[PDB]
């Protein structure tokens, strides 16, 4: 209370534009890229985004006096012009800790991005980054396991982990799936996996696929003498269904399951991360639907946020993009968020799109996955851009090799070891790239067959 209740509308500006404000170390901060509507002062646009995101509505309600908005109000503490840009700004908003439910990305998302993106007063809105305070980070479980334990479990060090998505996407039988799996794995891939839309359909039922890929990976691991795994997709239509599948994988002794976190949802993911933690499965996150949110530079949510959100809710691996392949993605930005995915502390670096220093107070890091339209000739670049702490996946690039899967595997495994040694001997994957695999193509019949096939392919197209 204090100050009479005076009914009626007032600009947002009056309460949620606070340039005065001194951020608290426990505040959630957000960098929104706002583009107002013609007559809207940025500081009003900016104040609406903060109000309608925290404590306020469009008119004056007496109830405010029951509590104290100074404590609760979300607040726009600064605007910045987007240099060389169409009436577009960076409104910075700070959200007090007290506003968020502990352990819940769902909650956090409901607040920050709940309703503001549809304001009539704005024409476009996009969240670029969020500063998650340690006081909030400590309330999440985060990854079931993270980078070190994963390596430690599968016993695998020095070099990118290799994987392949069986294809065709849909239409293969429980049994063919197995066949294909075994064949890719014995070749020398570390993992094979279900395509993100392989759940349980009339052509192949989850329980059938799960039973045979278990048979197969077990065959391929005995054969090679190297721990193998096949990502078994637990994405389902109901949490009960979802857990039920994760439960079978556990019954089989297999090591990793997978889940489409955005089509599944944060509420369901969080549940699976907990289930994995307690049951010891590694969980692979697939980011289906994402580009629906993260493509346009003017409206939506940037992937670096989507990525943060996942290290929070739970996942051992997350698909981070390839720079160099079939889907969109620039190098600097990717580098930025990949550190957001694996490091303990990441210093703010506008160069790379990181608007805030992120301190993860030891939440496990997540292994980024490079996938989609990549082949043998990209090896040295991937290797370069990502480092050993990455998973590199060959779908088309494995089942696409002229002599079948086993060989297609062997090709990739050599391509990569090749690149890895070049690197270690001191070669320069960026300059010297091309000779290196070129060189190895010469000594490897399977590697060769590959080289010849995808030699001329690139996906150069001017990015969004």
């Amino acid at each position: 209370a204090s100050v009479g209740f005076k009914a009626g509308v007032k600009e947002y500006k009056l309460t949620y534009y606070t340039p005065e404000y001194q951020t608290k170390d426990t505040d959630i901060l957000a960098a929104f890229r706002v583009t107002p509507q013609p007559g809207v002062p940025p500081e009003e646009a900016g104040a609406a985004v903060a109000a309608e995101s925290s404590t306020g509505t469009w008119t004056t309600v007496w109830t405010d006096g029951l509590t104290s908005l100074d404590r609760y109000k979300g607040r726009c503490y600064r605007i910045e012009r987007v240099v060389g840009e169409k009436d577009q700004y960076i409104a910075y908003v700070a959200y007090p800790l007290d506003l968020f439910e502990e352990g819940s990305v769902t909650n956090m998302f409901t607040s920050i991005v709940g309703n503001v993106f549809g304001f009539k007063a704005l024409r476009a809105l996009r969240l670029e980054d969020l500063r998650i305070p340690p006081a909030y980070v400590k309330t999440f479980q985060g990854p079931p396991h993270g980078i070190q334990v994963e390596r430690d479990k599968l016993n695998k060090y020095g070099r990118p982990l290799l994987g392949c998505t069986i294809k065709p996407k849909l239409g293969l039988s429980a049994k063919n799936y197995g066949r294909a799996v075994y064949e890719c794995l014995r070749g020398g891939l570390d993992f094979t996996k279900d395509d993100e839309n392989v759940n349980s359909q009339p052509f192949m039922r989850w329980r059938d696929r799960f039973l045979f890929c278990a048979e197969a990976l077990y065959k391929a691991q005995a054969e090679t003498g190297e721990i193998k795994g096949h990502y078994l997709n637990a994405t389902a239509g109901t949490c009960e269904e979802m857990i039920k599948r994760a439960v079978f994988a556990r019954e089989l002794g297999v090591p990793i399951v997978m889940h489409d976190y955005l089509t599944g949802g944060f509420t369901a993911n969080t549940s699976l991360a907990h289930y994995c933690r307690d049951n010891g499965l590694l969980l692979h996150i697939h980011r289906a639907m994402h580009a629906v949110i993260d493509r346009q530079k003017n409206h939506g949510i940037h992937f670096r946020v989507l990525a943060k959100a996942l290290r929070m809710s739970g996942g051992d691996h997350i698909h981070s993009g390839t720079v160099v392949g079939k889907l969109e993605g620039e190098r600097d930005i990717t580098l930025g968020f990949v550190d957001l995915l694996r490091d303990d502390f990441v210093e703010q670096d506008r160069s790379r799109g990181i608007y805030f220093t992120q301190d993860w107070v030891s939440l496990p890091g997540v292994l980024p996955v490079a996938s989609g339209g990549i082949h043998v000739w990209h090896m040295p670049a991937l290797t370069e851009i990502f480092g050993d702490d990455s998973v590199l996946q060959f779908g088309g690039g494995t089942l696409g090799h002229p002599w079948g899967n086993a060989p297609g595997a062997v090709a990739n495994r050599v391509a990569l070891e090749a690149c890895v040694k070049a690197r270690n001997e001191g070669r320069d994957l960026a300059q010297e790239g091309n000779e290196i695999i070129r060189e190895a193509c010469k000594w490897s019949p399977e590697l060769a067959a590959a080289c010849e096939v995808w030699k001329e392919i690139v996906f150069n197209f001017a990015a969004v």
Partner: protein
């Protein structure tokens, strides 16, 4: 087109898909490790060349991952040559051992590297 054989190609993780590493080549490795700050360490096994699952099958459990430490992690060492020495030193004594070389990143606590330094006869 040729059938990748199904029979005597047991692997050893990193580098086991390239041709047998020459001592020079191998040297490059211990060299890299070093270059980076990893403490080199050695472990040998004379009986279970590969993972198994005899005691348990829960997810993630596999018997045969742990190997025997050869002496201690050579903290402070900077002589690439000295670790190589050790390899020699162990095939002498465990001729039938599988010997490997690993690199500890103590700040991250991860084995930043590992490559087999020596398979026994007929592997």
């Amino acid at each position: 087109m040729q059938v990748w054989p199904p029979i005597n190609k047991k692997k050893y993780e990193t580098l086991s898909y390239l041709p047998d590493l020459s001592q020079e080549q191998l040297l490059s490795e211990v060299e890299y490790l070093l270059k980076n700050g990893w403490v080199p360490c050695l472990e040998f096994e004379t009986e279970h060349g590969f993972v198994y699952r005899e005691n348990n099958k829960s997810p993630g459990y596999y018997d045969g991952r742990y190997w025997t430490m050869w002496k201690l992690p050579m903290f402070g060492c900077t002589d690439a040559t000295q670790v190589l020495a050790e390899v020699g030193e162990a095939k002498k004594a465990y001729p039938q051992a599988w010997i490997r070389i690993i690199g500890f990143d103590n700040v991250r606590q991860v084995q930043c590297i590992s490559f087999i330094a020596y398979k026994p006869e007929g592997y």
